[PDB]
């Protein structure tokens, strides 16, 4: 069975020019831990499959923090990738974040010609890319942003909708108080399909270490903050 994931770096938006070299920035989302690779470094560089013309990244060659072989993608784990290119005039280009799981092994990412909302700046777009045969379950990484936006795409498989909302409160609620109001959080759950009480319970579980002492994690909203934001009653 195939451990490579493929990238079509030939049929691209006009702005990408003509591809010279291809890179794959792959990271863990849930159920696994991967070390950070270097943007467009040795570890990320893909080779062209002469048979098909597709570039590929072999997940079996991933290494863990200790430098040992990771053993590939895990069952019950979520990942994400950015494919980037350097074109023949040395300009960098990159896809949006695309979700990735074991069922994608052997499949191909292509540019759709569409865009998705950039999670850092809602006035900007990323180039949309998705899977040829797995787009129903993996694709552009849906995200909840620092401003409380819910961007288009696929959600992680092994992370619940309530847990994703709680993660967003954890990351953003204290630092962006004015975007994380009870009514925006309310709309976040509705668009993401998370029941507020489920979010509250998920929050309490996923951030028990962090809620323990505030001085260690000022940016982690205490449960009293979370209940009110969710309109819930821990009672």
Residue numbers in the entry: 3 to 237
Provide the authors' original text about this structure.
Ruminococcus bromii is a keystone species in the human gut that has the rare ability to degrade dietary resistant starch (RS). This bacterium secretes a suite of starch-active proteins that work together within larger complexes called amylosomes that allow R. bromii to bind and degrade RS. Starch adherence system protein 20 (Sas20) is one of the more abundant proteins assembled within amylosomes, but little could be predicted about its molecular features based on amino acid sequence. Here, we performed a structure–function analysis of Sas20 and determined that it features two discrete starch-binding domains separated by a flexible linker.
The N-terminal β-sandwich most closely resembles a CBM26 module, which can be found adjacent to catalytic domains on α-amylases and typically binds maltoheptaose and β-cyclodextrin. A search on the DALI server showed that CBM26 from the Eubacterium rectale α-amylase Amy13K (ErCBM26) had the highest structural homology to Sas20d1 and aligns with an RMSD of ∼2.3 Å over 85 Cα atoms. While ErCBM26 and Sas20d1 share a conserved β-sandwich fold, two long loops formed by residues 146 to 161 (loop A) and 169 to 189 (loop B) protrude from Sas20d1 and are not found in ErCBM26. When comparing the native and maltotriose-bound Sas20d1 crystal structures, the CBM26-like fold at the N terminus is nearly identical. The Sas20d1 crystals with maltotriose (space group C2) have 45% solvent content and a tightly packed arrangement, with a crystal contact at the helical bundle. In each monomer, the helices (residues 237–257) are sandwiched between the same helical region (residues 237–257) and two β-strands (residues 58–70) of the neighboring monomer within the asymmetric unit and a loop (residues 93–104) of a symmetry-related monomer. In these crystals, there are no crystal contacts in the region surrounding the helical bundle, which in part explains the elevated B-factors. Not surprisingly, the pocket of the native structure has an area of ∼783 Å2 and volume of ∼1350 Å3, whereas this space constricts to ∼521 Å2 and a volume of ∼848 Å3 in the maltotriose-bound structure.
